[PDB]
Nucleic acid binder design. Structure first.
Ligand code: CA
Ligand code: CA
Length: 725
RNA sequence: UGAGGUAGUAGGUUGUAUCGCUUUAGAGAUAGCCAUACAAUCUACUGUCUUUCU
């Protein structure tokens, strides 16, 4: 089926244009940037129980810098959620227009390989480092302040002590004797990443140092109580001896092994702050009594990389993917006005749920459903001077089906730019400077499969974001650019008396004829001066839905689309429209040949409600209450604000009752009280001339209600059943 | 913050069955938006258990 959720198809991953053809070249200008980490949201000690110090990225002065051959356009300050709290990352230029030589540039490239292959462990048999066939390639090099304090410059005395050390890829060859006892230097291990030598010869385990335990010595650690001392442990399990028995033990904690840092660990998947209320004493006791690795400096080789830069390196996958999460492919916004929405907002008009990062596609597309319906409806109602409700409902439903929405999103190119998968850097991320998967002589490193429904939903969320930001001219221009055309959008013996009603509603009509149209049938032909109240019911149902949805969206209560649509249906049900049209006296001006239809419900409501239904609901009472809205709208130069001004006094107590009482239909609530045994019997005409429905739930007998149709009959039966429960 | 497994919570996702509301074409049908119950599956957190590391 063309727009079915089932029809999945395969789609590649687009490359931000700035991050392609981006390899630095000899005698080619570079653009040195800076990641710009600054810890502007520490974590609280009422929220952190690691029992471990916080490390701001400002304690030290060496930082990572991209070296694209292409200029990066400034991106909104985005956060990453490291061990030390929400870090606001800012990729802001540091220097530009300088030329490098060959030797230093090959040094840069070798350090880039060392970083992604050796440091981050993103090397797989399938992936081969080729920075000349790769599709996204740029160096990631360290920066420091030397000479002038203001200047940040490429470290060359660093990146040259990585080529003069032999503890980088292997373990240094060293010889310790009892005649030259091992000597300890505190400054060397102050910020150190240490690798154990006695084990994991294939792939060693890295751990940055975070403390020095001075009281702890090689003779008293006893961590696992089956061993007489610490030194005897290396001696029996590895047969290693120590030449210095007065050195301290070197407390230590792992390098981060999971490199998805775009989500917070102790908050919801909603962007909502929520600390846990359980294990409060236990979390502190946990990191206290838990086994913790206490290495020894004798046997651990110090990397040529200090912890202060390893900490900025670990965050490079997430930072280089969020900068890549179309933040730099804001070409969508360049193609699409008050300067457009923030690229942070457009990244919620491309992110689909089950991408689990803190943005949902929905709660922004529901508002898009109401505007597109309203825009299509208004465009039709004014495109043609004559069309019955059947024709317009036909035309509309074709221009707004999921099939057509899908066929318009994919034509734009929206499926590659989307975010459909969860971020796993080793499994489905292709790091920069790496050529697409092959080493073996469909793939998860450059393709993804998305349903046809999801393109049709993002085409809605994008409209929602442009709308809620730039107004209602921007949403219309956006749709018009997709392809959906929305932009080119005796008679004084029964008209006198409308002055009282106009004074009741506090609006005066520039042309009274619209009030007349809003009150005459398409079968009552005594009034031939004006047209039927049928086209107006169409515009008014769309508008009163758009306005109610915009109000509901603008509330700080932040309703999920489920509750939002439940409310929208709770107040646009035509029973309420009948009640509000008879309360404020719409019927007394309403010319019709209805014999006794609305009189019963009028007396019913005016007697019982003096501050569910036991009587039939007139179609007219419900449809005049919302043809008046269309009449105001079409009279007041197509202005939603006069309509909302006139209608908000009436609807205000109703809205502030329903946004707290959130009503629902008796049939659905019955099938939610017990769906196992509840079912409606097929229609069958009784001896009254009615239609009856037989309903049962076990234990309370059988229920029924006669009506003029199957829907009304089962509704009455459901009410009868639900009153007893 | 080593590789797993097993329960719960939170956020999703897929399929299937019963369904609500708005629109109307001539049990029920067209086109939109949810909810509910069962099942499969993924991510983040907490605890518990095995292995490893200290
Ligand atoms: Ca939709
Ligand atoms: Ca209607």
């Amino acid at each position: 089926r063309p727009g079915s959720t089932k029809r999945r198809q395969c789609y590649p991953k687009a490359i931000p244009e700035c991050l392609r053809d981006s390899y630095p070249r000899p005698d080619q200008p570079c653009y040195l940037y800076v990641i710009g980490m600054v810890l502007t949201t520490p974590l609280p000690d009422e929220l952190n129980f690691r029992r471990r110090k916080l490390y701001p990225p400002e304690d030290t002065t060496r930082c990572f810098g991209i070296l694209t051959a292409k200029p990066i356009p400034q991106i909104p300050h985005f956060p990453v959620y490291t061990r030390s709290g929400e870090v606001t990352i800012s990729i802001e230029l540091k220097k530009s227009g300088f030329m490098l030589s060959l030797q230093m540039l090959e040094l840069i490239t070798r350090l880039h390989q060392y970083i992604f292959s050796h440091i981050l462990r993103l090397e797989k048999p399938a992936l081969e480092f080729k920075p000349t066939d790769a599709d996204s390639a740029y160096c990631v090099l360290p920066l420091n302040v030397v000479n002038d304090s203001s200047t940040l410059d490429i470290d060359f005395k660093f990146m040259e002590d990585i080529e003069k050390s032999e503890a980088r890829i292997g373990i240094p060859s060293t010889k310790y004797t009892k005649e030259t006892p091992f000597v300890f230097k505190l400054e060397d291990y102050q910020d150190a990443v240490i690798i154990p030598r006695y084990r994991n010869f294939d792939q060693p385990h890295r751990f940055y140092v975070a403390d020095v335990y001075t009281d702890l010595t090689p003779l008293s650690k006893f961590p696992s109580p089956e061993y007489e001392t610490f030194a005897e442990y290396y001696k029996t399990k590895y047969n290693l001896d120590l030449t210095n028995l007065n050195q301290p033990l070197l407390d230590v904690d792992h390098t981060s092994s999971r490199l998805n840092l775009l989500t917070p660990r102790h908050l919801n998947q909603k962007g909502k702050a929520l600390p846990l209320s359980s294990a409060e004493k236990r979390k502190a006791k946990w990191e206290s009594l838990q086994n913790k690795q206490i290495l020894v400096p004798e046997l651990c080789a110090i990397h040529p990389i200090p912890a202060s830069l390893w900490r900025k390196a670990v965050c490079l996958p997430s930072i280089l993917y969020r900068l890549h999460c179309l933040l730099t492919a804001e070409e969508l916004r360049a193609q699409t006005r008050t300067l457009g929405p923030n690229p942070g907002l457009i990244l919620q008009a491309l992110t689909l749920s089950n991408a689990s990062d803190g943005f949902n596609l929905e709660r922004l597309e529901m508002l898009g459903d109401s505007f597109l319906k309203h825009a299509i409806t208004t465009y039709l109602f004014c495109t043609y001077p004559d069309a019955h409700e059947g024709r317009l409902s036909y035309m509309r439903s074709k221009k707004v089906s999921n099939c057509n929405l899908y066929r318009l999103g994919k034509k734009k190119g929206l499926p590659s730019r989307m975010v459909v998968s969860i971020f796993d850097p080793p499994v489905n991320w292709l790091p920069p400077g790496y050529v697409v998967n092959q080493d073996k002589s469909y793939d998860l490193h450059t393709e993804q499969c998305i349903a046809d429904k999801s393109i049709a939903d993002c085409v809605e969320a994008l409209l929602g974001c442009y709308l809620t930001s730039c107004g209602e001219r921007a949403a219309q221009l956006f749709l018009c650019s997709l392809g959906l055309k929305v932009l080119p959008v005796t008679l004084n013996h029964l008209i006198s008396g409308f002055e009282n009603f106009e004074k009741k509603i506090n609006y005066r009509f520039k042309n009274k004829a619209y009030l007349l149209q809003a009150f005459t049938h398409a079968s009552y032909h005594y009034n031939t001066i004006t047209d039927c109240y049928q086209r107006l019911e169409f515009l008014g149902d769309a508008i009163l839905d758009y306005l109610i949805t915009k109000h509901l969206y603008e509330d700080p209560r932040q309703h999920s689309p489920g509750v939002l649509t439940d409310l929208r249906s709770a107040l646009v049900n035509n029973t309420i429209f009948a009640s509000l049209a008879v309360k404020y006296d719409y019927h007394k001006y309403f010319k019709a040949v209805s014999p006794e239809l609305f009189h019963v419900i009028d007396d019913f409501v005016q007697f019982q409600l003096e501050k569910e239904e036991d009587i039939e609901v007139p179609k007219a009472m419900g449809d005049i209450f919302e043809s008046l809205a269309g009449a105001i709208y079409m009279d007041s130069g197509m202005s939603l604000e006069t309509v909302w001004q006139v209608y908000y006094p009436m609807m205000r107590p109703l809205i502030e009752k329903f946004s707290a009482n959130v009503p629902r239909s008796p049939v659905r609530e019955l099938l939610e009280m017990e769906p196992e045994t509840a079912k409606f019997s097929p229609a069958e005409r009784t001896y009254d001339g009615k239609v009856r429905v037989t309903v049962e739930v076990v234990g309370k007998g059988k229920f029924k209600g006669v009506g003029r149709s199957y829907r009304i009959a089962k509704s009455a039966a459901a009410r009868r059943a639900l009153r007893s429960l």
